[PDB]
């Protein structure tokens, strides 16, 4: 017989399997559309979630009540130290999909990249690229291989490496990420632009703009084995249920005679790859600038970013939230399709008070005067 009372299924089945992510960090999966003859630009950047602050903004959205009004909105700081470009991969679109022609690496790769290539750098034999550095550094090899990319590739990407030494992270190995070069008049314009960046730092200020929307891509916070009520959102049964109230009471009907994939079951909650899309960039700035958040106030919270560190160097504040806990790597891409009706940013205040405890002082100097 029927359920008797219409109610939706609890859960999205396009986020199945709900398994711990096998991919090491957030991966981009897809990249923004190439677009012919656009201005040449880099599609993504890798960053590390630092914290959240809350900003006062003047909202110019006509038709909203908050038009010419003031709003306090949550914003997430993601630390983005410059990334060294180390290689240039070209992919030819073929009947079988994009198949890489070749990846040409720089004559000198920095130690953080090499560290990624070995499990323990100290006990490693350190043989990676040993013959390649000799074959390269003559100049001729790179050009002949780059020529192969110009003739037989359509999708040129730059392989970049984050610098973990400029971060409060304990990593010491560079996250290596491919970033697509989009907007070239010809393929040869993209490879030539890439060669200018080879072995050289790329910064968020060049990659993104304030007011633009970005798709954060990251692995989420993990809660381990979790029950159906927490994992899928099923209703706890009445308090008198023998065997407990924290379960789905019927996992199916007599027919079909096997439990279905759509029936909620206990298992891993958290540590799943998720992309958050259409998040507008409130600001891109450097923590070396003493007045970045002053409208002296620099980006460092008084007391420091809880569970993160010092955010030294370049940072980007996106509006809203990003998947993942603090410290976690987040790949950030140009929005695939952006929310057209988003108001332009007018930050009038950024909170710099302690997020460790309930601080009432924006700066350490204010606290020093208060406690005279």
């Amino acid at each position: 017989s029927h359920r008797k009372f219409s109610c939706c299924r609890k859960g999205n089945l396009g986020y199945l399997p709900r398994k711990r992510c096998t991919r090491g960090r957030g991966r981009c999966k897809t990249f923004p559309p190439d677009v012919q003859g656009a201005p040449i630009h880099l599609t993504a950047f890798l960053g590390y979630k630092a914290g959240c602050t809350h900003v006062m903004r003047f909202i110019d959205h006509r038709g909203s009540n908050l038009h010419n009004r003031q709003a306090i909105d949550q914003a997430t700081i993601i630390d983005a130290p410059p990334m060294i470009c180390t290689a240039i991969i070209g992919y030819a679109k073929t009947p079988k999909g994009l198949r890489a022609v070749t990846t040409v690496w720089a004559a000198h790769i920095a130690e953080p990249a090499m560290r990624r290539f070995y499990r323990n750098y100290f006990h490693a034999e350190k043989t990676a690229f040993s013959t390649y550095m000799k074959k390269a550094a003559d100049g001729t090899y790179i050009k002949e291989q780059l020529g192969r990319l110009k003739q037989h590739a359509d999708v040129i990407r730059i392989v970049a490496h984050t610098q973990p030494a400029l971060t409060p992270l304990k990593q010491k190995k560079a996250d290596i990420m491919e970033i697509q070069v989009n907007g070239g008049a010809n393929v040869a314009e993209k490879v030539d632009y890439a060669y200018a960046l080879m072995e050289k730092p790329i910064s968020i200020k060049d990659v993104f703009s304030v007011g633009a929307q970005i798709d954060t891509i990251s692995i989420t916070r993990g809660r381990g084995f979790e029950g159906v009520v927490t994992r899928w959102g099923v209703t706890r049964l009445p308090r008198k249920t023998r065997r407990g109230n924290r379960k789905v009471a019927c996992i199916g009907a007599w027919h079909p005679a096997n439990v279905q994939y759509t029936v909620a079951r206990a298992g891993q909650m958290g540590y799943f790859h998720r992309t958050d899309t259409n998040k507008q960039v409130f600001m891109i700035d450097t923590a070396e600038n003493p007045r970045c958040c002053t409208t002296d106030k620099s980006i460092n919270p008084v007391g420091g970013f809880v569970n993160y560190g010092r955010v030294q160097g370049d940072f980007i504040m996106i509006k809203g939230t990003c998947p993942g806990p603090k410290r976690r790597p987040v790949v950030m891409r140009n929005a695939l399709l952006p929310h057209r009706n988003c108001p332009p940013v007018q930050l009038q205040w950024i909170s710099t008070a302690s997020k460790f405890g309930h601080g009432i002082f924006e700066t350490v100097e204010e606290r020093r005067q208060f406690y005279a």
Partner: protein, 134 residues
């Protein structure tokens, strides 16, 4: 009869709540029968926020004419804290409401105590009648 597109605020008064009278209409306490504009979900008690028109019945405390009838009302004060988009988190000492027709006219001449801006913006008569918008 509400004027404008309200931004969503936390609803602290579910069905069964007995909100107090904020008017001299003669009711002392109003029980919340139901909430207007409500498409619910299974098992979810209808819930209401300040500035939201609700259907109420007046208890034995009220004058006899007011009693025994489902009457329209607007919640003008809620104990539950709610966040205006400006970031202010505001709450009032008591949960109270004004008997009003859906058109907007109010049964009682006077409104007592502070009344939330959410009620006053949505319903103009509430703004004029209430002494304070807080």
């Amino acid at each position: 009869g509400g004027i404008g597109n309200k931004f969503r605020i936390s609803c602290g008064l579910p069905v069964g709540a007995v909100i107090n009278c904020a008017d001299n209409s003669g009711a002392k306490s109003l029980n919340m029968i139901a909430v207007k504009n409500w498409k619910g979900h299974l098992n979810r008690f209808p819930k209401a926020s300040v500035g939201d028109m609700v259907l109420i019945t007046v208890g034995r405390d009220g004058k006899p004419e007011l009693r025994r009838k489902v009457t329209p009302a607007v919640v003008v004060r809620q104990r539950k804290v709610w966040r205006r988009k400006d970031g202010v988190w505001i709450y009032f000492q008591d949960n109270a409401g004004v008997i009003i027709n859906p058109k907007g006219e109010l049964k009682g001449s006077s409104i007592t105590g502070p009344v939330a801006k959410e009620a006053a913006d949505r319903w103009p008569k509430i703004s004029t009648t209430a002494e304070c918008v807080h």
